[PDB]
From a paper:
In the present study, in order to elucidate the pyruvyl transfer mechanism of Pvg1p and also to understand the structural basis of its substrate specificity, we first determined the crystal structure of Pvg1p at a resolution of 2.46 Å. The purified Pvg1p was crystallized in the presence of Zn2+. Diffraction analysis of the crystal revealed a structure in which two Pvg1p molecules formed an asymmetric unit with two-fold axis (r.m.s. deviation for the 328 Cα atoms is 0.16 Å). Approximately 928 Å2 of the surface area was buried between the dimer, and it was stabilized by many hydrophobic and hydrogen-bond forming interactions between three α-helices and a β-sheet (α1, α6, α11 and β8). Because the predicted active sites were located far away from the dimer interface, the dimerization of Pvg1p seems to be not essential for the catalysis and substrate binding. The crystal structure of Pvg1p consisted of twelve α-helices and twelve β-sheets, and two α/β/α domains at the N- and C-terminal half regions. The folding pattern of Pvg1p resembled that of the type-B glycosyltransferase, including sialyltransferases. Charged surface representation analysis clearly showed a positively charged cleft situated between the N- and C-terminal halves of Pvg1p, which is suitable for the binding of negatively charged donor substrate PEP. In the proposed model, only the D106 residue is situated within hydrogen bond forming distance of the O6 oxygen of the galactose residue of Lac, whereas both R217 and R337 residues directly interact with PEP. Based on our predicted substrate-binding model of Pvg1p, less pyruvylation was probably due to the steric hindrance posed by the NAc group of the LacNAc-pNP with the H168 of Pvg1p, as a result of which it could not bind properly to the active site of Pvg1p.
Residue numbers in the entry:
A (entry chain A): 54 to 267, 283 to 401
B (entry chain B): 55 to 266, 285 to 401
Amino acid sequence: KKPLFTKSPRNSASCESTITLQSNLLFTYYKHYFAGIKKVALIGFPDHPNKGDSAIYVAEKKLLDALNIEVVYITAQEADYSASELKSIISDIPRDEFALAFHGGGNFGDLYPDHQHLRELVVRDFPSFTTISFPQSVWYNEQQLLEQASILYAENPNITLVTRDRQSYGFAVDAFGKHNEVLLTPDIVFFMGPIPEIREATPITHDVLILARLDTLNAANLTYSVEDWLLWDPPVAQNPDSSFDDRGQARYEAGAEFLASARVVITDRLHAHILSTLMGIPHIVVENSQMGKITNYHNTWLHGCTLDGVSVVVDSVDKALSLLLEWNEAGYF
Amino acid sequence: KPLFTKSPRNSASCESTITLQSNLLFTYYKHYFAGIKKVALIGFPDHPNKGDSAIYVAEKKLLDALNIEVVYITAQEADYSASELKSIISDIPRDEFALAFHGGGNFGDLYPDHQHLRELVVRDFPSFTTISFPQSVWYNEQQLLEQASILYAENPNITLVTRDRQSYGFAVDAFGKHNEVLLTPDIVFFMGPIPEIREATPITHDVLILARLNAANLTYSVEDWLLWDPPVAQNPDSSFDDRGQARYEAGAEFLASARVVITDRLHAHILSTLMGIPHIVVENSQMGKITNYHNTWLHGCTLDGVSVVVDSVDKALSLLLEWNEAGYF
Ligand SMILES: [Zn+2]
């Protein structure tokens, strides 16, 4: 009953509506495109410390569970991929009940040839199945790399590409839109819905958390942490005998608790921004890169969460601190 | 009972696609019309184009489904009255009233009057929930784009809805700094499957060529659905609703008179899809008048017996014959 953002109740209603909209669109799109599917192989599981990519995995599980679809196989990298093992797993499954699902996020571009290569390997071993991605960021600065990657999608018109932001959508359409369906949906993590439970369960350890690149102790009676949520990793994730699911769950929960430790967050990471929004943690986001790592997504989907006490975007970390103080005297956290 | 009876398996795929588009329209507009009870429709198409009138009826249908009443309609500047609209909304709470821009292809170089009416209405009535029905949007001329951009920059509350990929990309680059821009299906898909009017209309010709070999035994008509107009639409004492309804129904019956349609019009293509009439679509222009929309939304209706796109009218005839011997119509 109570607002997601306590301390900014009227503005909270607008962002809660926006969360619900994104969650419904995800369901509506994926219910349709997974019609008839009962079992799925997940391709490109993020077996590495990035908290946002693991949160993407958990939200993918949640959506698949909501559609009564079972994950019967997972591959992270080429090294752990086995065509024989996957061939045997799907031998007993009717063709129209099985799909290939590409793990979403920012794994489609110049910097991610291994992720693309795994997609190529799996689709060519198992062609003519319902094949679709979870919502991706997509961009190639280099034509040569784009031309290479385009052959897979041209030769397999059944593959449906899902993008999560307007710039990725426009790029995907121009590059692959002749042969493949291209969609624009929200980021899958919004299917988790409001998750204030974890905000309330986690004890507050600092007043502010700075999850961004850089110091200045403006002593307005506020403690702060300048930690990075990359690098460090839950011990369970470091275990080789642990399952993919265990690693992804642990990394998601760890990342969520990490943000919950503060009353306000300053961040330049998209999924620190997304998760804080879902948990009802007030936060300022810093767009300090070119490209648009934050702003491409934000301007596509989150206009309704762009409010005082909820979430705001600024062009620098110094601007974030200034606004933080206004929020403090306003009592937004 | 399939929508496309002579292509039952392929019909299922296109019916799903219709349902998807209808649900997205509802989901988006339910959200963005939250709290709204009454609406003024701006840019009503008071002219013979059948597709634009079909857009109007679908707009009515959606508004009715959200329990929203249309309390005012303006087609052109000549019939617009600020005083009349001001008095109509005087007793309505601010947050219960919205301005709704009539959708379709009325946003670009060729449509300065449509844009001008939008400018007039928003500046007389600023700070209301303001949103468009799904539009096609493109400006070839920078000078015209720059002029039209001022309205949307000065009124950040306006939400722009586009109906295709290219329009969305254009709208985003041009207006995306200040305004929300959406990509939804074309509003006419909220009508859902309408085979009733296909079944009610008697077949007059075998083929209808609605665009710019004969025997083996196929009759054909090369009519244009512009120009001619139901007599009720020509009546000045008729209401906007009557004209729009009549023009929609007339356009629908016109397509229903054939067993197959060849067309180069987007809404002949859309309506034929909804009615379950097999048809071939011809993309004979440069702009992508058909293909921008089709490739955004209708991959699932791109099947034999349902609907196919080709680059010329000659190609359409060739495929028609394959469909005839297959028995797709
Ligand atoms: Zn004028």
